[PDB]
Design a protein around this nucleic acid. Structure first.
Length: 325
RNA sequence: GUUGAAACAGGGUCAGCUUGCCGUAGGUGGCAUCGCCCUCGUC
């Protein structure tokens, strides 16, 4: 019940309305947010950081799910609206040219195909014309707080249109349906069942998503690579017959659990905990309020469900806690 | 005779380079074994 209980918990937290991913999204921490108008025109380089003692990468936002880059020719991935700082302005402080310009080309091709596949929106058109103007992207570097996003690497950039100032370009009721259909019709034409945690059909989720929060890099939880990690010659990903509608759910659940109030590490291991809500545990997650008060009592309402104490390493996630009691 | 196969915790490194328990000092200023008794009480 590694991902079975996690899937059941996600099916409980998703239908509770409390800031969680769905279909094909994920709560990503975007540092600097770019605000424009209706037709390109870079007009604001806003930043929403300043949280803890260290300047985190901005607030959390429900962006489309990351397709999982990390590779040589990594520009062939080309995410939807959110990516790296070399996919928007083709800038590279330590990445270099050529390799970063092709990333911008792939990103503008992606936004162009999204525009031609979903027109009349006053949102995707702005980001599509912003990358094909060749006069505002250079102005982005000459903003007001641009000298701060260059000293820190891994700066994610998002787009926010005008007449909203609260919803990103990937938040209006238009591209959300496209992203939901991508993980419903496009991401369902592959290998058949049977699933691993749901027992139903579901396509075999090849190339599992990456979990951000455990390690410095988005470390994938369960992912088979190399060669000896195969059972019967499944060759990368097919070793675990896990469906998309469950792998995505567990990855998004680990992402939401590695960035909220339940995220706390005792020492080189993040021992995140949760409950069944039928959460309100106030026992394991209550290990960092203010000055450690006395909240332990006996109200005959001790919820069940175990806790997953996972630890990072290089880019994998190691499981060490397993106890239903 | 068609069934978990492959796994190293290691490659390896002086806990010391070192340090006076020491300058510090009267067991003493001071007190009768005595105030007392036949080895014959017998021969």
């Amino acid at each position: 019940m590694i991902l079975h209980a996690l899937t059941q918990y996600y099916q409980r937290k998703a239908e509770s309305d409390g800031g969680i991913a769905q279909e094909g999204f994920e709560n990503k921490e975007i540092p600097f947010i770019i605000v424009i108008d209706k037709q390109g025109n870079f007009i604001q380089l806003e930043d929403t950081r300043e949280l803890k003692v260290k300047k985190k990468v901005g607030r959390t936002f429900l962006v489309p799910k990351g397709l999982g880059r990390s590779g040589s020719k990594s520009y062939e991935v080309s995410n939807l609206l959110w990516d790296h700082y070399g996919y928007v302005l083709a800038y590279a402080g330590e990445k270099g040219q050529e390799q970063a310009d092709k990333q911008h080309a792939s990103f503008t091709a992606k936004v162009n195909e999204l525009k031609q596949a979903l027109p009349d929106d006053a949102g995707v058109t702005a980001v599509a014309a912003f990358l094909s103007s060749a006069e505002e992207k250079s102005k982005v570097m000459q903003a007001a707080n641009w000298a701060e996003c260059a000293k820190v690497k891994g700066c994610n950039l998002s787009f926010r249109l005008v007449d909203e100032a609260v919803d990103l370009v990937c938040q209006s009721k238009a591209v959300r349906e496209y992203v939901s259909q991508a993980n419903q019709t496009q991401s369902d034409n592959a290998q058949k069942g049977i699933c691993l945690v749901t027992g139903k059909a579901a396509p075999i989720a090849r190339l599992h998503n990456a979990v951000k929060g455990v390690n410095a890099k988005p470390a994938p939880f369960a992912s088979v690579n190399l060669s000896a990690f195969e059972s019967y010659g499944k060759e990368q990903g097919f070793a675990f017959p896990i469906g998309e509608q469950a792998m995505f759910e567990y990855t998004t659940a680990l992402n939401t659990l590695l960035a909220g109030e339940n995220r706390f590490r005792i020492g080189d291991v993040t021992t995140v905990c949760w409950g069944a809500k039928r959460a309100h545990i106030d026992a394991v997650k209550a290990l960092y309020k203010s000055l450690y008060n006395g909240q332990y009592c006996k109200p005959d309402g001790e919820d069940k469900f175990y806790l997953l104490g996972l630890s990072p390493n290089s880019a994998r996630i190691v499981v060490r806690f397993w106890h239903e009691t």
